[PDB]
Write a protein that binds this ligand. Sequence first.
Ligand SMILES: [Mg+2]
Ligand SMILES: [Mg+2]
Ligand SMILES: [Mg+2]
Ligand SMILES: [Mg+2]
Ligand SMILES: [Mg+2]
Ligand SMILES: [Mg+2]
Ligand SMILES: [Mg+2]
Ligand SMILES: [Mg+2]
Ligand SMILES: [Mg+2]
Ligand SMILES: [Mg+2]
Ligand SMILES: [Mg+2]
Ligand SMILES: [Mg+2]
Ligand SMILES: [Mg+2]
Ligand SMILES: [Mg+2]
Ligand SMILES: [Mg+2]
Ligand SMILES: [Mg+2]
Ligand SMILES: [Mg+2]
Ligand SMILES: [Mg+2]
Ligand SMILES: [Mg+2]
Ligand SMILES: [Mg+2]
Ligand SMILES: [Mg+2]
Ligand SMILES: [Mg+2]
Ligand SMILES: [Mg+2]
Ligand SMILES: [Mg+2]
Ligand SMILES: [Mg+2]
Ligand SMILES: [Mg+2]
Ligand SMILES: [Mg+2]
Ligand SMILES: [Mg+2]
Ligand SMILES: [Mg+2]
Ligand SMILES: [Mg+2]
Ligand SMILES: [Mg+2]
Ligand SMILES: [Mg+2]
Ligand SMILES: [Mg+2]
Ligand SMILES: [Mg+2]
Ligand SMILES: [Mg+2]
Ligand SMILES: [Mg+2]
Ligand SMILES: [Mg+2]
Ligand SMILES: [Mg+2]
Lengths: 129, 150, 141
Amino acid sequence: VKVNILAECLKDLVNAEKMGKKQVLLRPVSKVVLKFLRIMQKNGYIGEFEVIDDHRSKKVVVELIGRINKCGVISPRYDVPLADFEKWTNNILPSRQFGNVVLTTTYGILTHEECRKRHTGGKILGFFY
Amino acid sequence: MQMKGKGKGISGSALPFKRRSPKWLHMTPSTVVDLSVKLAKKGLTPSQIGVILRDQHGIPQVRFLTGQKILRILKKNGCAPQLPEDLYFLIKKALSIRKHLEKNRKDKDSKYRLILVESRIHRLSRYYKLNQKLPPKWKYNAQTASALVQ
Amino acid sequence: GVGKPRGIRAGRKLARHRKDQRWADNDFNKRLLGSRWRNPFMGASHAKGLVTEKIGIESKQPNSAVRKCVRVLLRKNSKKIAAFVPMDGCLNFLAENDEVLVAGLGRQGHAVGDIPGVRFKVVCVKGISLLALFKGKKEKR
RNA sequence: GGAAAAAUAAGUAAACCCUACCAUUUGGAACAACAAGAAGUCGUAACAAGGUAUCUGUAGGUGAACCUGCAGAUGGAUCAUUA
RNA sequence: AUGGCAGUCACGGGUAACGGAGAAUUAGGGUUCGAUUCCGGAGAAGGAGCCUGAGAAACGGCUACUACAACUACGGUUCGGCAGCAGGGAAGAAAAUUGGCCAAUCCUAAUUCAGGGAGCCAGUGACAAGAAAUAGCAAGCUGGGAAACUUACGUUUCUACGGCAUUGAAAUGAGAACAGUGUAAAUCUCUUAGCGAGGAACAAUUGGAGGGCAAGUCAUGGUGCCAGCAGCCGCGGUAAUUCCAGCUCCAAUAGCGUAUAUUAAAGUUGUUGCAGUUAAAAAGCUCGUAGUUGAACUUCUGUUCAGGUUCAUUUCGAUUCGUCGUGUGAAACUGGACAUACGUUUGCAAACUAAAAUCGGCGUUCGACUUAGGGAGUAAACAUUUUACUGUGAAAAAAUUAGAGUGUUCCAGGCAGGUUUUAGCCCGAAUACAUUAGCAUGGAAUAAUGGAAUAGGACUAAGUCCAUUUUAUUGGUUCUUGGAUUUGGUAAUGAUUAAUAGGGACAGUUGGGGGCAUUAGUAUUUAAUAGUCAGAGGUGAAAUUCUUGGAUUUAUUAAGGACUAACUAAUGCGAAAGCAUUUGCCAAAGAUGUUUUCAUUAAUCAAGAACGAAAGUUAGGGGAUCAAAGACGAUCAGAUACCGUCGUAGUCUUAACUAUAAACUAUACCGACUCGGGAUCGGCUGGAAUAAAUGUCCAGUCGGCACCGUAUGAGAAAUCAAAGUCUUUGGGUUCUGGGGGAAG
Ligand SMILES: [Mg+2]
Ligand SMILES: [Mg+2]
Ligand SMILES: [Mg+2]
Ligand SMILES: [Mg+2]
Ligand SMILES: [Mg+2]
Ligand SMILES: [Mg+2]
Ligand SMILES: [Mg+2]
Ligand SMILES: [Mg+2]
Ligand SMILES: [Mg+2]
Ligand SMILES: [Mg+2]
Ligand SMILES: [Mg+2]
Ligand SMILES: [Mg+2]
Ligand SMILES: [Mg+2]
Ligand SMILES: [Mg+2]
Ligand SMILES: [Mg+2]
Ligand SMILES: [Mg+2]
Ligand SMILES: [Mg+2]
Ligand SMILES: [Mg+2]
Ligand SMILES: [Mg+2]
Ligand SMILES: [Mg+2]
Ligand SMILES: [Mg+2]
Ligand SMILES: [Mg+2]
Ligand SMILES: [Mg+2]
Ligand SMILES: [Mg+2]
Ligand SMILES: [Mg+2]
Ligand SMILES: [Mg+2]
Ligand SMILES: [Mg+2]
Ligand SMILES: [Mg+2]
Ligand SMILES: [Mg+2]
Ligand SMILES: [Mg+2]
Ligand SMILES: [Mg+2]
Ligand SMILES: [Mg+2]
Ligand SMILES: [Mg+2]
Ligand SMILES: [Mg+2]
Ligand SMILES: [Mg+2]
Ligand SMILES: [Mg+2]
Ligand SMILES: [Mg+2]
Ligand SMILES: [Mg+2]
């Protein structure tokens, strides 16, 4: 069946920027899918976006700037102590210059980087660069 | 698409947007609740009752109008169909198969088909039992089926 | 997904799988099955022995030659050994019944491409390194 | 009254034997067997539609490779012909 | 009484397995070891027993047995157990002196003085680690050069320079030594006088020179597939670039080869990070509990204040060899507050305001001082229970990292720095990491879990009953405090949507899906009824075969067993194997259609089951055709083979059993995406013509085989619309592979 729609939505989107789509329609959407989205948006990867009210679980449409190179999730969302960071930064990110490894915390959801600010982080969620 | 590594499609049914009751219709929740329980008393499936209220008395979605789902309405009014359509029917055909098999003790495609159908029933029991929506000592074997036949 | 399962709750599975699918390695399968202990040296690096006789063996495929070899009897092990005597005149020093020290040739298994069923090298005669006997100014008895 | 040897019963239980079983090592032969190699010997299976094809399964026969029946698959010697 | 444990691996077996601290290599993750200075455990020849004591089953104590060691006048005895040191024997690839002392570290005792193979000294000692010499300088000759002087090979000069069986004196440890230091003594080191270097010397090896793998293009000598080399390619058979050796070269260099186990290269065991059409690898196919994996909703949000933070700066003040302060904007953090909005009580502190009092001036203008009031400000009680994350408590020392620190550098020790305050001064022995399980604690995400649905819950008041603390104590009342009910009041009383998830209901319809019946049709045989006439049949040719007791042949008809033609095609259905004459029953299925219910019920799956052409098997049927074995002809040098004539088992069936097949798309299932295009099969919805057809066409569209074109997507390529969305390496799950042959 379906799982981690964040992943469903995410790749559907990558496939977008990769194919050169002008905009994308993500079918199954959730708070997570949206938060991640406004985090990419806030950092300037995706453009303006609209959430249509599917009386079941909303559908979102994201405008595509053309700067997204890749944005995926990470299989089981392992736990990650602040000490476990460089491991993943050198692992997932294409450089020490596009630090975008989204994590889930108790302090909500922060950028790979913000988690060092707040000083907590926790489970990995996804990445984008 | 259930027990099918190969076959799969989309039957239909998509509740329209507007969550309110149709304009043209006037019927205090109660009005319907009567028809519903009356119809039910005659011996009807909440599954079938709803069908009437749509085909016959233009009530698209009883839930939207009452703020009550059929089976609930029925249960509140003592008119609750003991065993759920779900299980009931599966067991029905599950049985029909057995009868046919007897006089055709050789029909293999049917032995198989029953195996699948009996398999499902064990899946519902697991479920309906876990939602304390069916006594734990429930057991469909051959006697549970013939028990309902009487 | 691929074959391997990616669950945070399914570590056990992956674990047992690796321990299992791992027997497919010979290097593993080898040391794991106390195989090293059953060879003629009994794991050992070297072994002493008595010369049972100097025999010669023929080269294989594109080569044709009389290889110098000594049949040795290992001490505590007590096995018949096929041992290749190195360099040129070498066998001229090995007197029958003397004590010899033998070691393998490149990873215990395949003999040098040329040799047939020989798996050992001879390094000492009466406890005198061969090389030593090979160069005049060194030693001789 | 204390108290040595002796003797006593239940007990801990050494060794030994018998009855089963486990583990680890190590052993054994003529004929036989296995391994590898070749311009040994007899033929030619396979490649080439390799004398009108291989190949899988199963069955039966034969100096030998293999042939043959039934059923498949092309990795075929076809990606094709109701007018 | 009958339990206790187990696939979340019991029980049992192996371990050249005593566990840790740690050790070796390491991008990350890992791989392999830990006999061995710390700690804990076990044991003293094997095994049991015991005395004694605060304390051991001790074992440098005892008893018996098994196997042993020492003496004997053979009666009997041993303070007989080295896995303590030093030594022998043994084993074996393999590990030092039967030395010295109590001086240092500690220990023991009645104990400042005694004893200690603990321990320290020394011997042996290329395990291993640190530093480091085997030469340096210059003249001259000379090659180079080179800058020059300058049409040519000639002079000046200088230089990164570089050569020499030519020159020359300075330098210096090895060495060897009176002294001093040091020491328990002795050895050595260190300081140091007399003595101490010029070519076989006072000294470099080891291992190579085809490729990988740095280095011979020697026309070198010997050898002639011999001797031998070679890690793997391969060298060698008379002109070897790999043998033997010379020469010259290269590499590491007081070191360098070799053997074996092991680390990395190994994305060649892969969680990160592989492969699985054809290279090894998807199971033939479905069901299915364990396991693994699971859709979406529940304070969003706004305004303002504040603390920093950053960043920006048509900018300000300071300092210099690079920072601070100030202002804006901005973001977000935070923390407040307030907004139907993360809490309540307490005590503290309190900050301001509304009243009332008192005090002063002239009821009021105002001011100081009181009660009430919450933020804010702490501590305890609450927010379903964990995961997970923060943080600190705990995680021995040594080791690793690491600060200070010129042990002559360094290993490394933890010391040392200044006598110019010197009967004293200054400064040190820091710090980090420590995951796994436990504790304290901050928390809002994901994830799981939970609360009110039979009803009952919640809050509140009263009534009643049970239980009960302090009231001295015992009763009896009351009462506080818990619990039980009944009632009445209050509250918007209490059940998220309905997943282009899944299960059911229903509706016409579609199919060579299946099981019973039934029913044909030619044909092959064989038989009857007639009909002739000499050949049929079979091959390339013929031959066994059949035939005027009539063949082959023609007509009619019958029996029988199997089979379903032509229509039948990249078209249909079935989980797969498989399934095509008619008609009738029996239970089943997809897809489409749904403003129907149910609402996570689900994906895949070890166990564990249902199927699974052929061929084959058991016991009965049946027996037409074809036909394994067999019998024959022919063909061949050979034919028990490819052709031909016959023929048994089977092939058909009932009931059992067998499970494999190039069981093939050689491409696991569920899910989402992404190129173009028509044509299909099934369903549906609009429309047009005829006509009013279970038809045709146009246009949609779900679902199903399949094809065409194409990819700045994949690949080793063939090729792949998926074999794609994988170094920009991670949706969920099952199975499989790890050079070849021996081998399934
Ligand atoms: Mg679907
Ligand atoms: Mg070769
Ligand atoms: Mg041969
Ligand atoms: Mg065959
Ligand atoms: Mg056979
Ligand atoms: Mg054990
Ligand atoms: Mg170990
Ligand atoms: Mg110890
Ligand atoms: Mg303890
Ligand atoms: Mg000793
Ligand atoms: Mg002392
Ligand atoms: Mg003393
Ligand atoms: Mg005394
Ligand atoms: Mg020493
Ligand atoms: Mg050294
Ligand atoms: Mg002296
Ligand atoms: Mg000189
Ligand atoms: Mg040399
Ligand atoms: Mg050499
Ligand atoms: Mg040479
Ligand atoms: Mg030569
Ligand atoms: Mg080397
Ligand atoms: Mg290997
Ligand atoms: Mg509040
Ligand atoms: Mg039918
Ligand atoms: Mg014929
Ligand atoms: Mg007939
Ligand atoms: Mg059809
Ligand atoms: Mg037909
Ligand atoms: Mg069966
Ligand atoms: Mg039979
Ligand atoms: Mg002939
Ligand atoms: Mg025949
Ligand atoms: Mg129509
Ligand atoms: Mg159409
Ligand atoms: Mg590939
Ligand atoms: Mg294509
Ligand atoms: Mg991968």
